[PDB]
Short mmCIF file of N, CA and C in Angstrom, two decimals:
data_model
loop_
_atom_site.label_atom_id
_atom_site.label_comp_id
_atom_site.label_asym_id
_atom_site.label_seq_id
_atom_site.Cartn_x
_atom_site.Cartn_y
_atom_site.Cartn_z
N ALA M 1 7.58 9.43 -1.95
CA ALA M 1 8.75 10.41 -1.96
C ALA M 1 9.68 9.49 -2.41
N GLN M 2 9.75 7.95 -2.13
CA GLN M 2 11.29 7.49 -2.41
C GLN M 2 11.03 7.42 -3.90
N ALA M 3 10.14 7.46 -4.74
CA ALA M 3 10.05 6.62 -6.05
C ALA M 3 10.52 7.94 -6.59
N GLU M 4 9.92 9.40 -6.00
CA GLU M 4 10.17 10.50 -6.86
C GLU M 4 11.74 10.78 -6.40
N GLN M 5 12.03 10.69 -5.49
CA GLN M 5 14.02 10.73 -5.28
C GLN M 5 14.03 9.67 -6.55
N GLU M 6 14.09 8.25 -6.49
CA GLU M 6 14.18 7.76 -7.54
C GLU M 6 14.43 7.90 -9.25
N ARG M 7 13.03 8.51 -9.56
CA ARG M 7 13.38 9.11 -11.09
C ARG M 7 14.50 10.27 -10.96
N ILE M 8 13.98 11.28 -10.20
CA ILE M 8 15.43 12.02 -10.23
C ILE M 8 16.84 11.47 -10.28
N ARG M 9 17.12 10.79 -9.17
CA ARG M 9 18.62 10.28 -9.18
C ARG M 9 18.63 9.41 -10.49
N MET M 10 17.57 8.79 -11.40
CA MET M 10 18.11 7.72 -12.38
C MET M 10 17.88 8.76 -13.63
N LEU M 11 17.41 10.53 -13.43
CA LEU M 11 17.34 10.81 -14.61
C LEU M 11 19.17 11.78 -14.47
N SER M 12 19.76 11.94 -13.47
CA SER M 12 20.11 12.37 -12.95
C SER M 12 22.05 11.53 -13.28
N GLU M 13 21.74 9.85 -13.41
CA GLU M 13 22.61 8.75 -13.14
C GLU M 13 22.41 8.90 -15.27
N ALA M 14 21.35 9.26 -15.66
CA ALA M 14 21.40 9.15 -17.46
C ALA M 14 21.62 10.06 -17.75
N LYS M 15 21.70 11.29 -17.12
CA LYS M 15 22.69 12.40 -17.12
C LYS M 15 24.17 12.71 -17.15
N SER M 16 24.77 12.05 -16.26
CA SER M 16 25.87 11.84 -16.39
C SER M 16 26.63 10.83 -17.36
N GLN M 17 25.47 9.95 -17.68
CA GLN M 17 26.17 8.61 -18.76
C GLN M 17 26.05 9.47 -20.21
N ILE M 18 25.18 9.97 -20.39
CA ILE M 18 25.08 11.60 -21.59
C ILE M 18 25.63 11.82 -22.33
N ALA M 19 26.70 12.60 -20.64
CA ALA M 19 27.87 13.73 -21.01
C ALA M 19 28.93 12.55 -21.11
N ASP M 20 28.83 11.24 -19.81
CA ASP M 20 30.30 10.44 -20.88
C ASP M 20 30.08 10.40 -21.87
N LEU M 21 29.63 9.85 -22.58
CA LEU M 21 29.05 9.17 -23.55
C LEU M 21 29.51 10.28 -24.84
N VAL M 22 28.80 11.52 -24.30
CA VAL M 22 29.44 13.17 -25.67
C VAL M 22 30.57 13.09 -25.25
N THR M 23 31.64 13.31 -24.34
CA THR M 23 32.91 13.46 -24.78
C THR M 23 33.19 12.69 -24.78
N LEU M 24 33.21 11.51 -24.55
CA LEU M 24 34.32 9.97 -25.73
C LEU M 24 34.20 10.40 -27.37
N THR M 25 32.58 10.45 -27.46
CA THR M 25 32.31 10.72 -29.21
C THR M 25 33.48 12.20 -29.22
N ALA M 26 33.06 12.83 -28.55
CA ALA M 26 33.88 14.55 -28.83
C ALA M 26 35.80 13.83 -28.70
N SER M 27 35.73 13.17 -27.79
CA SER M 27 37.21 13.10 -28.08
C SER M 27 37.78 12.13 -28.97
N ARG M 28 36.73 11.03 -29.94
CA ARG M 28 37.25 10.81 -31.03
C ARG M 28 37.06 11.43 -32.21
N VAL M 29 35.57 12.59 -32.37
CA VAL M 29 35.99 13.25 -33.31
C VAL M 29 37.05 14.37 -32.80
N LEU M 30 37.38 15.14 -31.91
CA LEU M 30 38.10 15.86 -31.92
C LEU M 30 39.78 15.40 -32.71
N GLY M 31 40.20 13.84 -32.47
CA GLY M 31 41.64 13.33 -33.07
C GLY M 31 41.37 13.57 -34.63
N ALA M 32 40.58 12.93 -35.07
CA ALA M 32 40.19 13.19 -36.77
C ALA M 32 40.42 14.32 -37.40
N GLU M 33 39.41 15.30 -36.20
CA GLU M 33 39.28 17.22 -36.98
C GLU M 33 40.77 17.46 -36.61
N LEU M 34 41.32 17.18 -36.15
CA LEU M 34 42.51 17.43 -35.03
C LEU M 34 43.63 16.92 -36.42
N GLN M 35 44.02 15.97 -36.82
CA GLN M 35 44.66 15.05 -37.88
C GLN M 35 44.52 15.96 -39.03
N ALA M 36 43.22 16.04 -39.49
CA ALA M 36 42.93 16.38 -40.46
C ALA M 36 43.38 18.58 -40.75
N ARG M 37 43.16 18.23 -39.59
CA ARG M 37 43.80 20.09 -39.40
C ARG M 37 44.94 20.14 -39.78
N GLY M 38 45.79 19.36 -38.95
CA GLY M 38 47.88 19.71 -38.69
C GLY M 38 47.36 20.27 -37.12
N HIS M 39 49.37 19.93 -36.77
CA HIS M 39 49.13 20.82 -35.47
C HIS M 39 50.75 21.31 -35.88
N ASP M 40 50.45 22.07 -36.55
CA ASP M 40 52.00 22.63 -36.50
C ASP M 40 52.76 23.84 -35.92
N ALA M 41 51.67 24.74 -35.42
CA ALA M 41 52.03 25.80 -34.93
C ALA M 41 51.42 25.43 -32.63
N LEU M 42 51.53 24.23 -32.97
CA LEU M 42 51.44 23.63 -31.30
C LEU M 42 52.96 24.72 -30.69
N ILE M 43 53.95 24.25 -31.55
CA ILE M 43 54.96 24.72 -31.12
C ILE M 43 54.98 25.64 -30.61
N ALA M 44 54.57 26.71 -30.93
CA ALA M 44 54.28 28.37 -30.94
C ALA M 44 53.77 28.39 -29.18
N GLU M 45 52.65 27.63 -28.55
CA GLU M 45 52.07 27.99 -27.91
C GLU M 45 52.59 27.32 -26.68
N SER M 46 54.39 27.22 -26.61
CA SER M 46 54.81 26.35 -25.46
C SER M 46 55.39 27.73 -24.79
N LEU M 47 55.76 28.72 -25.68
CA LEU M 47 57.11 30.34 -25.18
C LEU M 47 56.38 30.70 -25.08
N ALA M 48 54.92 31.36 -24.80
CA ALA M 48 54.70 32.74 -24.79
C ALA M 48 54.57 33.25 -23.38
N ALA M 49 55.48 32.31 -22.01
CA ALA M 49 55.83 32.99 -21.04
C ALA M 49 57.31 32.04 -20.35
N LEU M 50 57.35 31.21 -21.53
CA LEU M 50 58.81 30.55 -20.53
C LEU M 50 59.45 30.16 -22.68
N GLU O 1 -25.48 -16.18 54.97
CA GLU O 1 -26.28 -15.86 53.22
C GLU O 1 -25.36 -15.14 53.43
N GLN O 2 -25.23 -13.51 53.91
CA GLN O 2 -24.25 -12.46 53.89
C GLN O 2 -23.16 -12.48 53.16
N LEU O 3 -22.67 -13.37 53.85
CA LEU O 3 -21.15 -13.69 53.40
C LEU O 3 -20.99 -14.13 52.22
N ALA O 4 -22.12 -15.57 51.76
CA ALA O 4 -21.80 -15.83 50.60
C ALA O 4 -22.50 -15.06 49.48
N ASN O 5 -23.44 -14.26 50.04
CA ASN O 5 -23.46 -13.01 48.96
C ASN O 5 -22.86 -12.03 48.31
N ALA O 6 -22.27 -11.89 49.10
CA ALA O 6 -20.89 -11.54 49.59
C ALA O 6 -19.45 -11.83 48.85
N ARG O 7 -19.48 -12.98 48.64
CA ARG O 7 -18.91 -14.33 48.32
C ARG O 7 -19.08 -14.12 46.49
N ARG O 8 -20.49 -13.96 46.18
CA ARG O 8 -20.29 -14.46 45.10
C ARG O 8 -20.78 -13.13 44.24
N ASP O 9 -21.02 -11.64 45.17
CA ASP O 9 -20.78 -10.65 44.31
C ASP O 9 -18.96 -10.38 43.77
N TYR O 10 -18.35 -11.00 44.50
CA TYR O 10 -16.68 -10.82 44.57
C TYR O 10 -16.38 -11.55 43.19
N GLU O 11 -16.78 -12.80 43.36
CA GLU O 11 -16.71 -13.78 42.52
C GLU O 11 -17.29 -13.05 40.84
N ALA O 12 -18.13 -12.97 40.94
CA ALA O 12 -19.34 -12.21 39.62
C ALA O 12 -18.31 -11.34 38.99
N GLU O 13 -18.15 -10.53 39.81
CA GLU O 13 -17.28 -8.98 39.34
C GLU O 13 -16.07 -9.15 38.36
N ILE O 14 -15.36 -10.11 39.54
CA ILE O 14 -14.62 -10.61 38.89
C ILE O 14 -14.10 -11.63 36.95
N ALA O 15 -14.66 -12.21 37.81
CA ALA O 15 -15.09 -13.18 36.11
C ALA O 15 -15.40 -11.84 34.92
N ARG O 16 -16.85 -11.54 35.26
CA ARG O 16 -16.96 -10.44 34.07
C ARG O 16 -15.80 -9.20 33.61
N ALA O 17 -14.93 -8.83 34.76
CA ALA O 17 -13.80 -7.78 34.53
C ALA O 17 -12.94 -8.71 33.68
N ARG O 18 -12.14 -10.15 33.93
CA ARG O 18 -11.26 -11.08 33.49
C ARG O 18 -12.23 -11.42 31.44
N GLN O 19 -13.31 -11.33 31.77
CA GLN O 19 -13.54 -12.11 30.52
C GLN O 19 -13.62 -10.75 29.41
N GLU O 20 -13.90 -9.74 29.90
CA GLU O 20 -14.20 -8.48 29.26
C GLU O 20 -12.88 -8.23 28.79
N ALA O 21 -11.51 -8.38 29.40
CA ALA O 21 -10.18 -8.23 29.42
C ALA O 21 -9.91 -8.78 28.59
N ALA O 22 -10.30 -10.62 27.93
CA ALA O 22 -9.88 -11.20 27.11
C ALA O 22 -10.63 -10.94 26.31
N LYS O 23 -12.00 -10.56 25.84
CA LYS O 23 -12.37 -10.04 25.23
C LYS O 23 -11.95 -8.46 24.06
N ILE O 24 -11.45 -7.37 25.25
CA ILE O 24 -10.78 -6.71 24.64
C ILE O 24 -8.97 -6.96 23.61
N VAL O 25 -8.67 -8.10 24.84
CA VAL O 25 -7.02 -8.04 24.16
C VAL O 25 -7.27 -9.45 22.76
N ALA O 26 -8.44 -10.07 22.49
CA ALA O 26 -8.67 -10.96 21.74
C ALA O 26 -8.80 -9.47 20.37
N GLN O 27 -10.10 -8.54 20.59
CA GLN O 27 -9.87 -7.56 19.70
C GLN O 27 -8.97 -7.44 19.01
N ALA O 28 -8.03 -6.31 19.72
CA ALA O 28 -6.99 -5.53 19.72
C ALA O 28 -5.53 -7.23 18.93
N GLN O 29 -5.67 -7.80 19.38
CA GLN O 29 -4.78 -8.66 18.23
C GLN O 29 -5.22 -8.57 17.15
N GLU O 30 -6.37 -9.16 16.81
CA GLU O 30 -7.24 -9.14 15.74
C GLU O 30 -7.14 -7.97 15.01
N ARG O 31 -7.50 -6.75 14.88
CA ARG O 31 -7.21 -5.62 14.80
C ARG O 31 -5.57 -5.40 14.62
N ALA O 32 -4.43 -5.49 15.60
CA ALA O 32 -4.00 -5.20 15.05
C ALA O 32 -3.21 -6.47 13.89
N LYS O 33 -3.67 -7.17 13.48
CA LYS O 33 -3.11 -8.49 11.96
C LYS O 33 -4.05 -7.79 10.91
N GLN O 34 -5.34 -7.32 11.33
CA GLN O 34 -5.76 -6.44 10.28
C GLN O 34 -5.09 -5.27 9.52
N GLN O 35 -4.54 -4.37 10.82
CA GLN O 35 -3.45 -3.49 9.81
C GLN O 35 -2.29 -3.53 9.78
N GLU O 36 -1.64 -4.93 10.19
CA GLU O 36 -0.48 -5.12 9.58
C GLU O 36 -0.39 -5.56 8.65
N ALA O 37 -1.44 -6.64 7.97
CA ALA O 37 -1.81 -7.15 6.63
C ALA O 37 -1.76 -6.02 5.27
N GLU O 38 -2.65 -4.81 6.32
CA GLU O 38 -3.15 -3.89 5.32
C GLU O 38 -1.84 -2.97 4.92
N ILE O 39 -0.97 -2.92 6.05
CA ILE O 39 0.65 -2.10 5.41
C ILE O 39 1.24 -2.75 5.03
N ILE O 40 1.42 -4.00 5.04
CA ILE O 40 2.04 -5.32 4.49
C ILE O 40 1.60 -5.05 2.99
N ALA O 41 0.09 -5.43 2.29
CA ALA O 41 -0.24 -5.13 1.64
C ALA O 41 0.07 -3.90 0.71
N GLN O 42 0.14 -2.89 1.48
CA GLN O 42 0.06 -1.18 0.85
C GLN O 42 2.08 -0.93 0.10
N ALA O 43 2.60 -2.20 0.92
CA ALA O 43 4.01 -2.45 1.14
C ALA O 43 4.31 -2.84 -1.00
N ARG O 44 3.83 -3.48 -1.08
CA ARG O 44 4.09 -4.31 -1.95
C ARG O 44 3.66 -4.15 -3.17
N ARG O 45 2.24 -2.87 -2.65
CA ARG O 45 2.07 -2.40 -3.90
C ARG O 45 2.98 -1.31 -4.11
N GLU O 46 3.76 -0.57 -3.16
CA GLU O 46 4.69 0.22 -3.41
C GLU O 46 5.64 0.08 -3.98
N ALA O 47 5.80 -1.23 -3.62
CA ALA O 47 6.77 -1.17 -4.84
C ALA O 47 6.62 -1.41 -6.16
N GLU O 48 5.58 -2.35 -6.60
CA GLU O 48 5.58 -2.18 -7.53
C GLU O 48 5.21 -0.75 -8.53
N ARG O 49 4.50 0.15 -7.67
CA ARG O 49 4.56 1.00 -8.39
C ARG O 49 6.00 1.86 -8.01
N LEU O 50 7.05 1.50 -7.14
CA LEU O 50 8.68 2.01 -7.97
C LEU O 50 8.98 1.48 -8.74
N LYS O 51 8.92 -0.07 -9.10
CA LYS O 51 9.02 -0.87 -10.62
C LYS O 51 9.06 0.46 -11.76
N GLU O 52 7.33 -0.22 -11.38
CA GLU O 52 6.97 0.24 -13.06
C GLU O 52 8.01 1.95 -13.47
N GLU O 53 7.89 2.99 -11.81
CA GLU O 53 8.37 4.05 -12.36
C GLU O 53 9.82 4.04 -12.95
N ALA O 54 10.22 3.02 -12.46
CA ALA O 54 11.99 3.36 -13.08
C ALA O 54 12.20 2.84 -13.50
N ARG O 55 11.11 1.26 -14.16
CA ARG O 55 11.14 1.73 -15.85
C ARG O 55 10.86 2.21 -16.96
#
C-alpha cells in the first residue's frame, strides 16, 4: 500500500510540475502574443466602474 | 527406602520439568529468530519493489 501511495503522489507531483511548466510556457508565449497584439485599449478597461 | 524413593521421584520430576522448559525455551528462541529473519528479508524485498516502482 505504501508503494501504491508513492506512485499516486509521484504522479500528483509530476502533475504539479507539468502544470507549473505549462504556466511558465503560457506566460512566455502570452508576452510574445500580447506584444504583437498591442495593448492600446487597456486604458478603457480601467473605468468601467471608476 | 520410602524417603529415598519420594526424594528420587521429586528430583526426577523437577529435572524433567527443567529440561522440558529449557528445550521449549531454545526452540522458541530459534523460531523467533527465524521469523525475524524472514520479516527482515521481506522488508528488503519490499524496499526493492518500492524502488523499482518509483523508477
